[PDB]
């Protein structure tokens, strides 16, 4: 009704009147703020066979100052959308306002701690607070809708609006209608889709006011126990999802808006390498094919690429990395076996239209397969073909199971295999067997081996099939032609002709066979060989693949290669490929246009040969260049003390006074005489400092303090220059009560208590009504024994200027409250000429905080994608210390020696200057009376990739400039 570009029925979306299965990956632009690398991710997603990406926008990063929306430069969404368009990827836009996303505040800016109203409710104070943000971000989204020639096809209002408490009459139809109307009022006409955290029917079509267009829900069924990555708990495989769908939203396509693609990992967790093992290739093939058993038509994987929680953007439970164990790693590599496995399923879905028009049946333990050890879920079509999802009935089983099938076909029901032998399902695997499968007018009566892809070319048809090692498979084709083996041995290939078919049996081998039946060639592959195949769209007008439309899907070619094939196009007599290589690679092209006479790879003329079956072959040699990385320990390190506050000369007269008698925080009433909540004063991010002035009686004994920074925070306390102690932190503690013994004080003299508190980020707000994002940061309680609370007058600081934040280029979260950060010394070219020469490897000999600066040059070669990492040593149990590392002003490492787990910190090209000068600024906070130092600090690299990527422009890296608003 509002537009005709994106429509739907009960089975699927239609894009311009044509059915499409939306297969999407989650990618957050704020977690990879380099536009050329955003294109890289999109191309890697397109190469999976996917057609869509889903993204959040993080409000906290783009309206750090209330009333000043800023989504420019590294936060600009427009180049992100243009990269999607260039890669041929549609978009699902998810701007919140609430996003969760393991991000600080769940996306909410810290100034929402001053809103007198329930967050995510119809309370006017909350709704008013969101209006400026939504009117801006939804306008930008509206501009790039498919209706205007852009990539954006779906819009999600809100996020997991599923749980309420604490007086909210949940679900509130007035609230969701308001949120939906905000988007519509900004020009969004595309369909609205929700993402209910459970299949709870919230806001489904037919619920009236507040209903979305398409009901969606989320699912993370294998959970998050990354420490036990081989354990698949009983009952974790979903079976009822289609049943629930038909009850909850039968008129719309079945949609999972976030299906598990990895896992979060908290401070002190096992690490994302473990998460990648839990959500590995086996998880994908069993759980994702299980989603196909429900006839899922919109499927988005959270995350496909996670990136990095740089500049304090992450929530307090998480650390710097957001690798997530996803198919594309944090450093952008696609080496994980789960990437290649996922590509097999994405490419199946891309070419199998009968999947969407079939009639799904209930799961079975008999009737299709001949054993109750297997479960088969049928999707039955008459003329349009059927699909049979096979798995172990006990989904965690690692047993090898022999079986036979009884399948319905247009030629009659058949027991498979016909020619002898049995099929095998080896352990944690699942197959989609097909019947009456259409290969451009050629009917595949059945195939037990799975379809990777098929194409019609000018000189014939090609079908690509694969099985796992040790499997026997069989197929049958509607034809009067016989079968001929045209590549590979005839060994273990059996066949029979009937009146109207040919039947072919085969055993999986590491050596490819190609068979020919009439004008159809069939590749018979093992899974590990199929991992190396790619199906780029072949452009004939320009160089860009275009979106996954029926015509552009049909025009694709089949390329065997190695690490990556990005694109293909035909220009005159030239066939052009763009691809990446991490080893010497044999390239084969199947379906070369008749007019192509010359091969180009990444623009370079490349020799080729043609075999007797018309396949082009070429070789791309890999010879990694010398990568010369400077020794970080040998740099000319300059040091400055970044806790001058504990010197008796320090003058804090320009610091904000923490003197508000009333809090604007509705969640927690004050238990101190004035507010010491950082967000009451506009300080939401990074290290916080508090200074408490009093005049001593001389009879003081102890000072007690309750500090709160979120999970794994630490704090340190001094009385003038005398170290009192630290809370060194635990993941289990978001606050801590300490009682410190004081030295003997002199009656009538003034003293200042300096408190440093690590703010780990603001809490999320998952349950509507609970207002947990309002959880304060700072000092909750204090008691100077024998003195009234009012004896201490407090000052505080976070990032200089608070909400009037200094760095408009790097955003409102990047820098905290340390002296060196307040001065802007973390940026390139600090005023360090007269600073002392000292290294973070030398470090501190007492409790305190040091700031260290050094530059280094890189001269890495053009045409190579080279992942670089910062490494902080932890070979033996350390003393407690905390580190931040700024790279050209951008914070790309937060490190807690005693909690971990992260020691390896990837930093992307664009943040790093590969042919230029780079700046490291390192803060070292020793939470120990004996001080602390780094064990080691090193740059490293992983496998250089010979890349098709264009040059990466360095992002804006503002140099140090004296700040007039500083407290000096
Ligand atoms: C694709 O992207 C991925 C994500 O971005 C990326 O994965 C990341 O890769 C980096 C670099 O390899 C990882 O950091 C390293 O991790 C090492 C520990 O992990 C290994 O060992 C574990 C325990 O045995 C294994 O569980 C683990 O396997 C798991 O993870 C693998 C992926 O990492 C995966 O493939 C497996 O299937 C599995 O799931 C893994 O094998 C750690 O040792 C290493 O630190 C050393 O190296 C640094 C330089 O790179 C140094 O700065 C540092 O000081 C360490 O060097 C010292 O120790 C080494 C080993 O003992 C020695 O060889 C060195 O010479 C050196 O020795 C000195 O110091 C010693 C004290 O430590 C001392 O004993 C000696 O005397 C000497 O003085 C580093 O932290 C990171 O963890 C990965 N991240 C994730 C999320 O996985 C992947 O690399 C990308 N791939 C490509 C191709 O690009
Ligand atoms: C250039 O780019 C290339 C990509 O284009 C890139 O190539 C890829 O490289 C990665 C490794 O980085 C490959 O993934 C690994 O593959 C390993 C080899 O097995 C594969 O190939 C065999 C044939 O050669 C197959 O037989 C094998 O199938 C079997 O195993 C599958 C996986 O378990 C299973 O699903 C199948 O059904 C079948 O049973 C497979 O296809 C593979 O061993 C390895 O798996 C381990 O690591 C994964 C995490 O990285 C885990 O998810 C997985 O469970 C395995 O974990 C084990 O090993 C880890 C250490 O690495 C430990 O941490 C774990 O605890 C665990 O170890 C325990 O269990 C072991 C049993 O497996 C046991 O022996 C141990 O003692 C211990 O008890 C992983 O999947 C990928 O296949 C390559 N892709 C392509 C397309 O080639 C290349 O590396 C790049 N080059 C450079 C230089 O950068
Ligand atoms: C450098 O090297 C050093 C030396 O090796 C490293 O030091 C080690 O660091 C380890 C990781 O931080 C640390 O282990 C931790 O020990 C604490 C006990 O003090 C323990 O709580 C931790 O385990 C929990 O937390 C982690 C995440 O931080 C989880 O992965 C784990 O499953 C545990 O989770 C439980 O507690 C959480 C917090 O309360 C809950 O959120 C969670 O749901 C779960 O709760 C259940 O269990 C609780 C009891 O455990 C129970 O109360 C609750 O009701 C629930 O049922 C973790 O094991 C080592 O102690 C430390 N070793 C030494 C010698 O110091 C250092 O990290 C390295 N540094 C770097 C940078 O790599
Ligand atoms: C503790 O530190 C404070 C300042 O942080 C010191 O305050 C000074 O006190 C002297 C008088 O002794 C004044 O003349 C100065 O103006 C104060 N300086 C500042 C910056 O306020 C205080 O003396 C220290 N306490 C002790 C016992 O040494
Ligand atoms: C399929 O399963 C549903 C849900 O349990 C049930 O209501 C229905 O009877 C089943 N249909 C058939 C044809 O067995
Ligand atoms: C098979 O595909 C051809 C063209 O690719 C089409 O004309 C025909 O309708 C399809 N057949 C079925 C049964 O879907
Ligand atoms: C069909 O091909 C097979 C070999 O692939 C052969 O045994 C058989 O004789 C052929 N049939 C005819 C009628 O030529
Ligand atoms: C919120 O507003 C109510 C009603 O005006 C007022 O009583 C209350 O003090 C306010 N609370 C905060 C924390 O500002
Ligand atoms: C001084 O402190 C001691 C020990 O707490 C206590 O006995 C005494 O009451 C204090 N003096 C005054 C004047 O409060
Ligand atoms: C610190 O003390 C306060 C007040 O008694 C209490 O509410 C809080 O839970 C305590 N914190 C911890 C971490 O035990
Ligand atoms: Cl200052």
With CA atoms as reference, report the closest residue to 497 among 514, 513, 518, 512: 518
What sections of 744-855 are H helices per DSSP? 819-822
Q: Whose CA is nearest to atom 4 of ligand 6?
A: 440
What's the rounded Cα separation, in Å, for the pair 919 and 623? 30
What's the rounded Cα separation, in Å, for the pair 511 and 509? 5
Q: Candidates 438, 554, 555: which one to mutate for ligand 6, based on the most atoms within 8 Å of Cβ?
A: 438
Element (H, E) at 246: helix 241-248
Q: Whose CA is nearest to atom 27 of ligand 2?
A: 528
Task: Give the ligand 1 atom nearest the CA of 582.
Answer: 93
Cα of 25 to ligand 3 centre, how many Å? Answer: 31
Cα of 337 to ligand 2 centre, how many Å? Answer: 7
Q: Strand pairing of 604-606 and 598-601?
A: antiparallel
Q: What are phi and psi of 560, to 5 degrees?
A: -90, 125
Neighbours of 50 (CB within 10 A): 30
What's the rounded Cα separation, in Å, for the pair 86 and 950? 13
Q: 943 in ligand 2 pocket by Cβ < 6 Å?
A: yes
Q: Whose CA is nearest to atom 14 of ligand 5?
A: 362
Q: 785 in ligand 9 pocket by Cβ < 6 Å?
A: no
What 3-state DSSP class applies to 68? strand
Which strands form 735-741's sheet, in the order they lie side by side?
Answer: 735-741, 702-708, 778-784
Element (H, E) at 811: none
CB 90 within 8 A of CB 151: yes
What 3-state DSSP class applies to 678? helix
- Per the document, the length of the chain is 968
C-alpha pair distances (Å), 659 with each of 584, 675, 779, 790, 797: 67, 7, 13, 11, 13
Q: Residue 254, annotated ligand binder?
A: no
CB 39 within 8 A of CB 9: no
Task: Provide the phi-psi class of 143: left if phi over 0, else alpha when psi is between -120 and 50, else beta.
Answer: alpha
User: So which residues are the catalytic ones?
Assistant: 160, 258
Q: 337 in ligand 2 pocket by Cβ < 6 Å?
A: yes
Q: Residue 888, annotated ligand binder?
A: no
Cα of 184 to ligand 8 centre, how many Å? Answer: 32
Kindly write down the DSSP assignment for every residue of 255-292, as one continuous string: EEEEEESS---BTTS--HHHHHHHTSHHHIIIIIHHHH
CB 895 within 8 A of CB 886: no
With CA atoms as reference, report the closest residue to 902 among 238, 150, 266, 432: 266
Neighbours of 373 (CB within 10 A): 16
What's the rounded Cα separation, in Å, for the pair 491 and 453? 25
Extended beta strands in 471-537, E state:
472-478, 483-487, 494-497, 501-507, 513-517, 520-526, 533-534
Element (H, E) at 570: strand 564-571
What's the rounded Cα separation, in Å, for the pair 930 and 402? 66
With a CB cutoff of 8 Å and minimum separation 6, the contacts of 834 are none
C-alpha pair distances (Å), 865 with each of 130, 554, 568, 857, 961: 40, 31, 20, 17, 33
Q: What are phi and psi of 551, to 5 degrees?
A: -65, -45
Burial annotation 499-526 (CB, 10 A radius, 16+ → b, else e): eebbbbbbbbbeebbbbbbeebbbbbbb
What's the rounded Cα separation, in Å, for the pair 847 and 208? 61
Sign of the C-alpha dihedral computed for residues 754, 759, 762 and 764 taken in this order: negative
19 half-sphere exposure, CB direction, 13 A CA radius? 17
With CA atoms as reference, report the closest residue to 222 among 267, 268, 285: 285
Pick the ligand that lies closest to the CA of residue 478: 6
Q: What domains can be seen in the chain, in order of their start residue?
A: 1-354 (3.20.20.80), 355-533 (2.102.20.10), 534-622 (2.60.390.10), 623-642+819-968 (2.60.120.260), 643-818 (2.60.120.260)
What's the rounded Cα separation, in Å, for the pair 562 and 948? 13
Burial annotation 836-853 (CB, 10 A radius, 16+ → b, else e): eeebbbebbeebbbbbbb
Q: Whose CA is nearest to atom 47 of ligand 3?
A: 732
Sign of the C-alpha dihedral computed for residues 671, 676, 679 and 685 taken in this order: negative
* Degrees to nearest 5, angle at CA 152 with 151 and 157: 170
Q: Strand pairing of 520-526 and 460-467?
A: parallel
What's the rounded Cα separation, in Å, for the pair 352 and 550? 11
Pick the ligand that lies closest to the CA of residue 701: 9
Sign of the C-alpha dihedral computed for residues 357, 362, 367 and 373 taken in this order: positive
According to DSSP, residue 5 is labeled: S
* Degrees to nearest 5, angle at CA 951 with 621 and 47: 65
What's the rounded Cα separation, in Å, for the pair 218 and 221? 9
Q: Residue 100, annotated ligand binder?
A: yes
C-alpha pair distances (Å), 938 with each of 472, 576, 633, 718, 824: 51, 40, 7, 33, 24
What's the rounded Cα separation, in Å, for the pair 908 and 893? 12
* Degrees to nearest 5, angle at CA 447 with 443 and 449: 140
DSSP lists the bridge partners of residue 300 as: 24
Task: Give the ligand 1 atom nearest the CA of 323.
Answer: 86
Q: Residue 458, annotated ligand binder?
A: no
What's the rounded Cα separation, in Å, for the pair 22 and 33? 26
**Greatest CA separation for the chain:** 110
C-alpha pair distances (Å), 497 with each of 405, 479, 514: 20, 9, 18
Q: 707 in ligand 2 pocket by Cβ < 6 Å?
A: no
What 3-state DSSP class applies to 421? coil
Pick the ligand that lies closest to the CA of residue 240: 5
Q: Candidates 229, 713, 731: which one to mutate for ligand 3, based on the most atoms within 8 Å of Cβ?
A: 731
Neighbours of 940 (CB within 10 A): 13
CB 67 within 8 A of CB 132: yes
DSSP lists the bridge partners of residue 294 as: none
- Helices H, strands E: what count in the chain? 14, 56
Element (H, E) at 181: helix 173-185
Cα of 927 to ligand 4 centre, how many Å? Answer: 25
Cα of 671 to ligand 10 centre, how many Å? Answer: 12
Using CA atoms in the order 883, 887, 888, 891, what is the torsion angle rounded to 10 degrees?
-60
Give CA 947 to chain center in angstroms.
22
Q: 240 in ligand 5 pocket by Cβ < 6 Å?
A: no
C-alpha pair distances (Å), 444 with each of 379, 461, 643: 16, 12, 74
What sections of 771-813 are H helices per DSSP? none
Q: 495 in ligand 7 pocket by Cβ < 6 Å?
A: yes
What's the rounded Cα separation, in Å, for the pair 30 and 32? 6
CB 799 within 8 A of CB 824: no
What 3-state DSSP class applies to 58? coil
According to DSSP, residue 304 is labeled: E
Q: Candidates 294, 359, 362: which one to mutate for ligand 5, based on the most atoms within 8 Å of Cβ?
A: 362
Cα of 482 to ligand 7 centre, how many Å? Answer: 6
C-alpha pair distances (Å), 642 with each of 825, 826, 849, 890: 10, 11, 6, 18
Residues with CB under 6 A from ligand 4: 648, 650-651, 720, 746, 749-752
Question: Could you tell me the resolution of this structure in angstroms?
Answer: 1.7
Sign of the C-alpha dihedral computed for residues 541, 544, 547 and 551 taken in this order: positive
Q: Whose CA is nearest to atom 9 of ligand 6?
A: 441
With CA atoms as reference, report the closest residue to 301 among 313, 311, 287: 287
What's the rounded Cα separation, in Å, for the pair 438 and 353? 9
CB 456 within 8 A of CB 554: yes
Q: Whose CA is nearest to atom 33 of ligand 3?
A: 269
Task: Provide the phi-psi class of 848: left if phi over 0, else alpha when psi is between -120 and 50, else beta.
Answer: left
DSSP lists the bridge partners of residue 885 as: 893, 922
Kindly tell me the burial class for residue 13, based on how many C-beta atoms sit within 10 Å of its own C-beta (0-12, 13-18, 19 or more): buried
Pick the ligand that lies closest to the CA of residue 738: 10
What's the rounded Cα separation, in Å, for the pair 19 and 13? 6
Q: 699 in ligand 9 pocket by Cβ < 6 Å?
A: yes
Q: Strand pairing of 255-260 and 217-219?
A: parallel
Cα of 646 to ligand 9 centre, how many Å? Answer: 28
Using CA atoms in the order 81, 82, 87, 89, what is the torsion angle rounded to 10 degrees?
30
Q: What are phi and psi of 739, to 5 degrees?
A: -120, 120
According to DSSP, residue 746 is labeled: P
Q: 281 in ligand 2 pocket by Cβ < 6 Å?
A: yes
Q: 877 in ligand 3 pocket by Cβ < 6 Å?
A: yes
Cα of 276 to ligand 2 centre, how many Å? Answer: 12
Q: 737 in ligand 10 pocket by Cβ < 6 Å?
A: yes
What 3-state DSSP class applies to 792? coil
Task: Give the ligand 10 atom nearest the CA of 734.
Answer: 13
What's the rounded Cα separation, in Å, for the pair 370 and 368? 7
Which strands form 472-478's sheet, in the order they lie side by side?
Answer: 359-360, 374-380, 386-392, 431-439, 442-447, 472-478, 501-507, 494-497
Q: Whose CA is nearest to atom 12 of ligand 9?
A: 699
According to DSSP, residue 681 is labeled: G
What's the rounded Cα separation, in Å, for the pair 284 and 844? 48
Using CA atoms in the order 867, 870, 873, 874, what is the torsion angle rounded to 10 degrees?
-80
CB 628 within 8 A of CB 940: no
Burial annotation 58-67 (CB, 10 A radius, 16+ → b, else e): bbbbbbbbbe
**N-term to C-term CA, the chain:** 62
What's the rounded Cα separation, in Å, for the pair 82 and 86? 6
With CA atoms as reference, report the closest residue to 425 among 467, 464, 380, 362: 467
Task: Give the ligand 1 atom nearest the CA of 871.
Answer: 52
What's the rounded Cα separation, in Å, for the pair 329 and 336? 8
Give CA 103 to chain center in angstroms.
12
CB 151 within 8 A of CB 27: no
With CA atoms as reference, report the closest residue to 430 among 221, 233, 290: 290
302 half-sphere exposure, CB direction, 13 A CA radius? 23
Pick the ligand that lies closest to the CA of residue 727: 10
What's the rounded Cα separation, in Å, for the pair 719 and 649? 14
Neighbours of 748 (CB within 10 A): 9
DSSP lists the bridge partners of residue 503 as: 476, 496
What's the rounded Cα separation, in Å, for the pair 91 and 300? 11
What's the rounded Cα separation, in Å, for the pair 307 and 38? 10
C-alpha pair distances (Å), 215 with each of 248, 480, 935: 8, 47, 53
What's the rounded Cα separation, in Å, for the pair 533 and 866? 24
According to DSSP, residue 136 is labeled: H
With a CB cutoff of 8 Å and minimum separation 6, the contacts of 491 are none
With a CB cutoff of 8 Å and minimum separation 6, the contacts of 604 are none
């Amino acid at each position: 009704l509002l537009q005709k570009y994106v429509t739907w029925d009960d089975k699927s979306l239609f894009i311009n009147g044509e059915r499409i299965m939306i297969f999407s990956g989650e990618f957050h632009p704020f977690r990879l703020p380099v536009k050329e690398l955003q294109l890289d991710i999109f191309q890697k997603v397109k190469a999976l066979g996917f057609n869509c990406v889903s993204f959040y926008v993080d409000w906290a990063l783009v309206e750090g100052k209330p009333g000043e929306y800023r989504a420019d430069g590294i936060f600009d969404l427009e180049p992100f959308f243009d990269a999607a368009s260039e890669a041929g990827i549609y978009l699902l836009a998810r701007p919140g306002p609430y996003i969760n996303a393991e991000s600080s505040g769940g996306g909410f800016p810290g100034w929402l701690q001053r809103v007198n109203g329930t967050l995510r409710s119809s309370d006017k104070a909350y709704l008013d607070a969101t209006d400026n943000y939504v009117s801006h971000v939804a306008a930008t989204i509206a501009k790039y809708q498919i209706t205007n020639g852009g990539p954006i096809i779906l819009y999600q209002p809100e996020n997991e609006y599923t749980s309420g408490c604490c007086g909210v009459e949940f679900p509130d139809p007035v609230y969701m209608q308001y949120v939906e109307d905000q988007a519509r009022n900004a020009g969004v006409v595309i369909p609205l889709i929700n993402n209910d955290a459970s299949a709870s029917g919230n806001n489904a079509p037919g619920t009236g006011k507040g209903a979305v267009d398409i009901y969606g829900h989320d699912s993370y069924p294998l959970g998050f126990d990354c420490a036990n990555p081989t354990v698949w708990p009983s009952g974790d495989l979903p079976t009822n999802f289609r049943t629930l769908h038909l009850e909850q939203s039968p008129t719309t396509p079945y949609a999972i808006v976030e299906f598990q693609g990895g896992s979060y990992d908290p401070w002190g967790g096992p690490g994302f390498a473990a998460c990648s093992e839990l959500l590995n290739n086996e998880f994908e093939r069993v759980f994702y094919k299980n989603d196909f058993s429900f006839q899922i038509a919109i499927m988005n994987l959270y995350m496909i690429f996670g990136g990095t929680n740089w500049g304090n953007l992450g929530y307090p439970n998480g650390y710097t990395s957001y690798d997530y164990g996803s198919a594309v790693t944090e450093s952008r590599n696609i080496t994980r076996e789960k990437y290649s496995e996922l590509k097999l399923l994405g490419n199946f879905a891309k070419v199998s239209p009968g999947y969407l028009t079939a009639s799904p049946g209930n799961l079975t333990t008999s009737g299709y397969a001949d054993t109750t050890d297997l479960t088969v879920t049928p999707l039955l079509g008459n003329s349009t073909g059927s699909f049979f999802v096979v798995r172990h009935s006990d989904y965690s089983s690692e047993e090898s199971t022999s079986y036979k099938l009884r399948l319905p076909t247009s030629a009659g029901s058949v027991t498979i295999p016909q020619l002898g032998g049995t099929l095998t399902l080896n352990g944690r695997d699942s197959k989609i067997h097909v019947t009456d499968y259409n290969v451009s007018g050629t009917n595949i009566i059945y195939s037990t081996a799975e379809v990777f892809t098929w194409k019609k070319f000018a000189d014939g048809k090609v079908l690509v099939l694969y099985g796992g090692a040790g499997e026997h498979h069989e197929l049958a084709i509607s034809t009067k032609s016989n079968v001929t083996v045209i590549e590979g041995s005839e060994s273990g290939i059996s066949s029979k002709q009937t009146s109207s078919s040919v039947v072919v049996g085969w055993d999986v081998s590491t050596t490819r066979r190609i068979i020919q039946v009439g004008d159809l060639k069939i590749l018979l592959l093992d899974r590990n060989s199929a991992y190396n195949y790619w199906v780029p769209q072949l452009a004939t007008d320009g160089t860009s693949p275009g979106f996954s439309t029926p015509e552009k899907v049909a025009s694709s070619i089949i390329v065997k290669a190695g690490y990556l094939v990005r694109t293909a196009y035909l220009k005159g007599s030239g066939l052009y490929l763009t691809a990446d290589f991490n080893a010497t690679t044999s390239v084969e092209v199947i379906g070369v246009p008749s007019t192509a006479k010359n091969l180009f790879i990444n623009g370079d003329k490349t020799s080729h040969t043609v075999d007797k079956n018309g396949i082009w072959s070429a070789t791309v040699d890999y010879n990694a260049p010398d990568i010369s990385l400077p020794s970080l320990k040998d740099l000319d390190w300059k040091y400055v003390d970044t806790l001058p506050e504990i010197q008796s000369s320090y003058d804090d007269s320009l610091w904000p006074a923490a003197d508000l008698k009333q809090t604007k925080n509705t969640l927690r009433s004050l238990t101190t005489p004035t507010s010491l909540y950082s967000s009451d004063y506009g300080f939401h991010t990074g290290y916080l400092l508090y200074r408490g002035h009093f005049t001593a009686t001389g009879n003081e004994s102890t000072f007690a303090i309750d500090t709160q920074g979120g999970s794994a925070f630490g704090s340190s306390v001094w009385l003038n220059g005398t170290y009192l102690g630290s809370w060194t932190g635990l993941y289990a503690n978001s606050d801590y009560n300490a009682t410190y013994n004081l030295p003997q004080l002199q009656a009538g003299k003034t003293y200042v208590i300096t408190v440093v508190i690590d703010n780990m980020g603001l809490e999320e707000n998952w349950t509507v009504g609970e207002d947990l994002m309002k959880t304060p940061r700072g000092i909750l309680n204090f008691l100077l024994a024998g003195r009234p609370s009012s004896a201490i007058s407090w000052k505080l600081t976070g990032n200089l200027g608070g909400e009037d934040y200094e760095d408009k280029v790097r955003g409102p979260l990047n820098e905290g409250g340390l002296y060196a950060e307040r001065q802007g010394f973390h940026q390139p070219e600090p005023p360090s000429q007269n600073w002392k020469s000292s290294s973070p490897l030398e470090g501190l000999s007492e409790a305190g905080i040091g700031f260290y600066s050094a530059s280094f040059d890189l001269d890495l070669p053009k045409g190579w994608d080279v992942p670089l990492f910062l490494n902080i040593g932890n070979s033996t149990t350390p003393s407690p210390y905390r580190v931040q590392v700024y790279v050209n002003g951008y914070q790309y490492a937060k490190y807690i020696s005693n909690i971990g787990p992260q020691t390896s910190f990837p930093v992307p090209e664009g943040i790093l200057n590969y042919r230029g000068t780079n700046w490291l600024a390192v803060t070292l906070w020793a939470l120990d009376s004996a001080g602390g130092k780094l064990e080691s600090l090193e740059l490293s690299y992983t496998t250089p990739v010979l890349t098709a990527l264009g040059e990466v422009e360095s992002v804006d890296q503002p140099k140090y400039k004296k700040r007039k608003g500083a407290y000096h």
